């Protein structure tokens, strides 16, 4: 499923401030990383990242590609490729707790300016 900005804003409203991250910053982050697509798959050399939150099999979920993964979110990675982002959010919260926003942004200055652009203005 490909969400719109305003759709995700409604779904994610309650996570605003979690780990000290503002909603617009998170929406910005998701745009850059998955384009708001629940089915996004990015394959790297030694790991794959899945879904809206681009959750990696290296540490976070169980996949046959990386048998030794710690599987911190205690879930099969296929769960991050469906249309229900509930479990995705559960795992993203763990990521925010442990790694923070730099899991996604890697210490780059992305999503630091004009954050109001990421708000839903339509309703
Ligand atoms: Ca899911």
Question: What residue spans define the domains of the chain?
Answer: 1-123
- Contact predicate 49/66, CB 8 Å: no
CA distance 117 to 70: 37
- Topology of domain 1-123 in CATH is Lysozyme (1.10.530)
Distance from Cα 89 to the centre of ligand 1, integer Å: 8
Give, in degrees to the nearest 5, the angle at Cα 80 between 94 and 108.
55
105 alpha carbon, distance to own chain's centre: 11
Residue 43, SS3?
strand
**97 annotated as belonging to a binding site for a ligand:** no
**87 annotated as belonging to a binding site for a ligand:** yes
Tokens of 15: 């996570």
Breaks (C-N over 2.5 A) in the chain follow: none
Residues in a beta bridge with 9: none
Residues in a beta bridge with 38: none
Resolution in A: 1.1
């Amino acid at each position: 499923k490909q969400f719109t900005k305003c759709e995700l804003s409604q779904l994610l409203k309650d996570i605003d401030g979690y780990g000290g991250i503002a909603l617009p910053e998170l929406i910005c982050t998701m745009f850059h990383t998955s384009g708001y697509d629940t089915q996004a798959i990015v394959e790297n050399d030694e790991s794959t990242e899945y879904g809206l939150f681009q959750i990696s099999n290296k540490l976070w979920c169980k996949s046959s590609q990386v048998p030794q993964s710690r599987n911190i979110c205690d879930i099969s990675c296929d769960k991050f490729l469906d249309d229900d982002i509930t479990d995705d959010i559960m795992c993203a919260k763990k990521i925010l707790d442990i790694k923070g926003i730099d899991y996604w942004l890697a210490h780059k200055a992305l999503c630091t300016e004009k954050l109001e652009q990421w708000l839903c203005e339509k309703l």
